[PDB]
Amino acid sequence: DEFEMIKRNTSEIISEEELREVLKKDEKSAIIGFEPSGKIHLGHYLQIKKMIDLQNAGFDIIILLADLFAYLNQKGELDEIRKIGDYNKKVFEAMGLKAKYVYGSSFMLDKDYTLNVYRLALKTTLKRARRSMELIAREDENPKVAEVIYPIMQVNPLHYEGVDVAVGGMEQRKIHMLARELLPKKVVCIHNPVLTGLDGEGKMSSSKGNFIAVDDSPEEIRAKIKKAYCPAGVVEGNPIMEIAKYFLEYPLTIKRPEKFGGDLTVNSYEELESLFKNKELHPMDLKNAVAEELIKILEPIRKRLL
Ligand SMILES: N[C@@H](Cc1ccc(C2(C(F)(F)F)NN2)cc1)C(=O)O
């Protein structure tokens, strides 16, 4: 079912009724924004996969290369950000996304865009702006005014003109709660789960070096997964299990030595989850399988990038 495939592997949809209205329409578009990133990782990929779901469901897809956002979030200088953006677009194309790419700066410095920023800046408390940004804002001992401008730009109605659906990570939900209240026309939010970093420590992220990047070499993927936090029995906050859930194809045929049970054919992730949880599946065999299926999943993307 179409709704159910869009919903597969999301954390929430605001709201599912509105989404149902959206899907009946002949024409619908879904946006996502990304601060240009030095490395594109499985956190990026999960979300582009969701956009590919939407595209399969007939949506026109818009990718905002959120360059001014990144500028405000201290990712550096704008033309240098825009060249990272340009690379991100190649990466996204190599994932098989069919989309229109927009650079934020091409319209975000327009007079109407800027007046909406100041209009919204009158309606938005500093306390709320700062709360919305707690998971987004670059680490800063002395937070900058830039921090609170960022979420009000993110809620600006000009980003969403003729857009039915916005997709983002659950780390975006407080900014989206703001836009829910303050956008003149409602946009459905589709929020994706945040992937745990390989060390189990916090979330996967470009600046935390705890990610597998989609163009990692096979041995690099192998070594990254070997090291990964993956306690026997434990599923919650286990990033190897997360990768099995969000990226793998089922049925999944786990190769093992007969000394360790021999080949294991798992028909669903929930099946994999119980086998791992009661312990018929060791970390090391999950890892080899995850690493090997992840390598196969990534390799056309690495190939195109190389
Ligand atoms: N805050 C996001 C980046 C981001 C920038 C801009 C938007 C958006 C967009 F329209 F959805 F793209 N409203 N502008 C949505 C997300 C991040 O953390 O990368």
Side-chain angles (χ1 to χ4, degrees), residues 31-35 64 66 69 136 150 154 159-160 166 171-172:
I31 194 152
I32 180 163
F34 290 103
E35 295 180 38
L64 181 74
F69 291 91
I136 296 145
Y150 186 117
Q154 183 161 332
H159 290 295
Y160 303 98
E171 80 283 355
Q172 316 286 319

Side-chain angles (χ1 to χ4, degrees), residues 31-36 62-66 69 73 107-108 113 133 135-136 150 153-156 159-160 163 166-168 171-172 175-176:
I31 194 152
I32 180 163
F34 290 103
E35 295 180 38
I62 304 172
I63 307 296
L64 181 74
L65 296 178
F69 291 91
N73 211 192
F107 65 92
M108 281 179 68
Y113 188 92
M133 278 302 278
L135 302 166
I136 296 145
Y150 186 117
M153 279 169 159
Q154 183 161 332
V155 142
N156 189 324
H159 290 295
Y160 303 98
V163 173
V167 179
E171 80 283 355
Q172 316 286 319
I175 293 171
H176 295 163

Side-chain angles (χ1 to χ4, degrees), residues 62-283:
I62 304 172
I63 307 296
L64 181 74
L65 296 178
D67 63 350
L68 230 198
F69 291 91
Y71 177 75
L72 286 168
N73 211 192
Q74 313 177 26
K75 300 299 186 285
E77 292 298 301
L78 234 200
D79 56 19
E80 168 225 320
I81 300 177
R82 304 181 51 82
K83 46 188 38 105
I84 310 173
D86 217 309
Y87 163 72
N88 288 189
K89 179 189 187 277
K90 282 146 164 49
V91 180
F92 297 151
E93 300 189 309
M95 308 170 164
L97 183 60
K98 315 260 178 253
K100 315 279 203 51
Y101 299 78
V102 309
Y103 284 93
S105 51
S106 71
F107 65 92
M108 281 179 68
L109 294 172
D110 293 351
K111 185 160 308 214
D112 65 339
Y113 188 92
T114 143
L115 285 167
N116 278 303
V117 167
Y118 302 153
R119 196 186 34 92
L120 287 160
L122 266 333
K123 283 144 139 100
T124 308
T125 71
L126 287 151
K127 181 92 196 291
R128 184 95 176 275
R130 303 219 52 202
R131 303 197 293 79
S132 79
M133 278 302 278
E134 279 169 12
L135 302 166
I136 296 145
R138 212 213 230 202
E139 202 170 24
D140 205 328
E141 276 169 1
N142 303 279
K144 300 305 187 284
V145 174
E147 200 186 271
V148 292
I149 288 174
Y150 186 117
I152 82 93
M153 279 169 159
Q154 183 161 332
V155 142
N156 189 324
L158 294 165
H159 290 295
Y160 303 98
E161 217 162 35
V163 173
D164 297 285
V165 165
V167 179
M170 283 286 280
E171 80 283 355
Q172 316 286 319
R173 75 191 302 265
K174 287 180 182 298
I175 293 171
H176 295 163
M177 283 323 99
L178 221 208
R180 293 294 288 193
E181 309 190 350
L182 295 174
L183 284 176
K185 344 203 304 148
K186 313 236 224 163
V187 180
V188 176
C189 318
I190 298 185
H191 293 143
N192 294 309
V194 186
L195 287 185
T196 311
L198 300 164
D199 54 352
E201 220 68 72
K203 309 306 194 142
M204 176 155 317
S205 87
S206 315
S207 65
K208 292 210 283 184
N210 63 349
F211 58 84
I212 293 172
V214 298
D215 63 325
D216 285 356
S217 74
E219 48 191 322
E220 201 187 1
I221 290 151
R222 285 178 198 117
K224 279 179 175 188
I225 288 155
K226 169 154 296 270
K227 218 268 131 71
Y229 178 74
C230 192
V234 174
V235 157
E236 187 132 41
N238 177 325
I240 309 312
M241 277 307 276
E242 279 183 7
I243 300 167
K245 183 186 187 177
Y246 300 116
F247 306 95
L248 276 37
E249 263 266 297
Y250 300 84
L252 172 65
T253 122
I254 296 184
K255 278 223 104 276
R256 319 136 104 190
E258 251 303 1
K259 180 177 178 197
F260 297 128
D263 299 359
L264 182 37
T265 290
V266 208
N267 286 329
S268 78
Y269 171 76
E270 22 286 328
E271 289 169 43
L272 181 76
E273 189 167 278
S274 37
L275 280 175
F276 194 82
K277 253 209 265 72
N278 90 249
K279 291 178 179 200
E280 301 170 74
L281 186 67
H282 208 259

